[PDB]
Amino acid sequence: MSESCILFFVKYPEPGKVKTRLGEVVGNDKAAMLYRHFVQDMLQGLARLHADLHICYVPGDADLPEKFKAWLGPQHMFAAQQGLDLGERMKHAMQKAFDDGYDRVVLMGSDIPDYPCELVQKALNDLQHYDAAIGPAFDGGYYLIGFRKDSFCPDVFDGIRWGEADVYQPTVEKMRRARLEVLQLPDWNDVDTVWDLNVLYRTNKNSSFRRSSTYALLRENDALIRQYDID
Template sequence: MADQPLIILFVKVPARSQVKTRLAAALGEEAALELYQRFVQDILDTLVQTGIPVMICYYPPDNRNAVAGWLGPEQKYLPQEGRDVGERMENAFRQAFNRGFSRVVLIGSDIPDLPAPLIKEALAALPMHDAVIGPARDGGYYLVGFRNDTFFPGVFSGIAWSTGTVFRSTMQAFGKAGQRVHELPLWQDVDTIEDLKDLAARSRRSAFSSSRTMSFLAGFKDAHLSLEGSDAPI
């Protein structure tokens, strides 16, 4: 069978009070909602540039029309199904492998500036490793991936999701199973106002400076977004 890679992008259907709630506490719900939409669109732009097929997995699962209206009918969509994020990730991988994809990586929507070379590195590592993972600064992970013949769903159960122990617990599960894991460089999710300041600071002189996210921040005038110690507010 021909080698068929796939990128799964996990998204939430954008709605007030349902996305980026910690940012909403600082910026307001409308600004947080707009930022989330731009995060996803920037990520999707990067994924499309890789030339690798993308499957958008959306939540809640009964809102396909809303997400397709937002991101376009030309995309491939799959509902997230499961009681928690672990079950939803496991089911997404199973669906992808059942459709014939041989190498699959899954990423979330909190990493708007994740560069395409990291995604390509993840997929390129899978022929030599059982799994690949990208640790996030908050103790979680921003990417996880498997080959169809090394898929290990055990890493999606018994995890205290949305805590600072997710990455450590996942690596322990990999270790107990004897899985060979390629670890990507550390990256930073954007969940809090401090994360957002860090994103703006590191992006001013990068290719991400021309992104939808940075364009919004450049025009967003709010005292919360003054970068301490910097002459470049966002």
């Protein structure tokens, strides 16, 4: 096993169970197909890094394990997320990875399909020299969190008001109070709404995300997406 591990948080892309806010505009089937492709594209990028990858899925029906294998492939490592809320789920996944013997672990979400893989590698590299890493999202939370084993502070997941506030500042505050040296990664936008999708589409003309399966889908949906232009 690698010294590094990437924990990749996903949900099975069933219509009506994912990206419902985007679905209100483009339809639940299309919102789920887009998200399906977000995940596929990110996996292709992550599966190539200098780190083991654990795909951690939102818990659900008993048929999920084989559904995941049939979708993303039987060769990947899949595990159900476990815990009462997102903070417990993250704490448990990271704690498990460290128990498994990893030195450096990053946990990230699956709503940032254009995120450059090299920044994930950079984060892992930088964790050799920092206690923690965090990537701020435009929406007030974070799209990535990482720790080196000897610095792991599970308490940063405790007492956060999941879904009731902006969690990034309280988190960075708990890290400061823990006397951690923290690497801050670039701000990035999670793609939640049709407006976010429009920006994703219009700002990645001429970047390497243009060759992705996600972007191919967006191009097919040009006439639809361009009806939601934001300045």
